[model samples]
Target: AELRLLMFEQPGCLYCARWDAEIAPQYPLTDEGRAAPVQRLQMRDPLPPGLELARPVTFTPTFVLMAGDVESGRLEGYPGEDFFWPMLARLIGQAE
Candidate 1:
């Protein structure tokens, strides 16, 4: 089954900016990126029709992994580039 990685972000969120600057550019080339493509959603924007989050996200750069219609894992905030990779790996592992 395909896994979905939904990134909840808002305009002017510094952490999200850092993620975009550092990790995002290269994400699509990674193994995890191949496994789960990102779907960025603005925090204030309405979710796409029929998409239901496991919980209300209160932080920017919250990464939520979903398998089919069920949520499997979530990582809140970008700790840093170093930690981000491993954490995303772990999150994908959980979803698998």
Candidate 2:
């Protein structure tokens, strides 16, 4: 319950769409994905109450990992499936 991922995205963001196509389908089947899970967030929407990020997210598809109510780390943008898996593993490892 302490760890969760915030996918700050909006409609028509190509990167978000790429991630949705490439990763979303496989996420729940992996160890890292199940650990934190994904929660989609509208970038235009106000930040959820009691949430605190290390910094503001200004980019589409900002993948934020939260340790309880605060930021642990974030991977900005879809760096493609090749880079995304290892990088997200690192972020989730650090959070753990």
Candidate 3:
């Protein structure tokens, strides 16, 4: 398995909360994380400095799609889709 998605989120972000309550429950990290893991890394976390702005993560709950160590794309903040499954399908499909 590869690192398909990296979500930069703050603990108290409203969008992050929505995702956790709505989307995350349906997928559930344990199961969905196995098939296609969504790694949540906090920007404020203690780590190496000088990480360039990889994507438009000006806001919390940004979704970054990566292949290996390279960033493919990202969805900044939340875009309330017309539907959920289709959006998820589309994003996960990109990983392949």
Top lDDT hit: 2
For each candidate in turn, the TM-score is 0.92, 0.94, 0.64
User: Candidate 2 versus the native: TM-score?
Assistant: 0.94
User: What is the per-residue lDDT of model 2 for residues 16-90, given as tens digits with 9 covering 90 to 100?
Assistant: 999999999999888888988999999989999999999888999999989999999999999899888899889
Displacement of residue 67 (Cα, Å) in model 3 is 0.9
- Local distance difference test scores for all models: 0.85, 0.91, 0.63
| C-alpha lDDT of candidate 1 relative to the true structure | 0.85
lDDT digits (tens) for residues 1-96 of candidate 3: 364567778867988888777766655445544555677788567522433345445678876766567665566666553454455556666767
Candidate 2, residue 76: the lDDT equals: 94
Q: Which ranges of candidate 2 are over 4 A from the true structure?
A: none
Error of 3 at 13 (Å): 0.5
Candidate that would win on TM-score = 2
Worst 10 residues of 3 by lDDT: 47-56
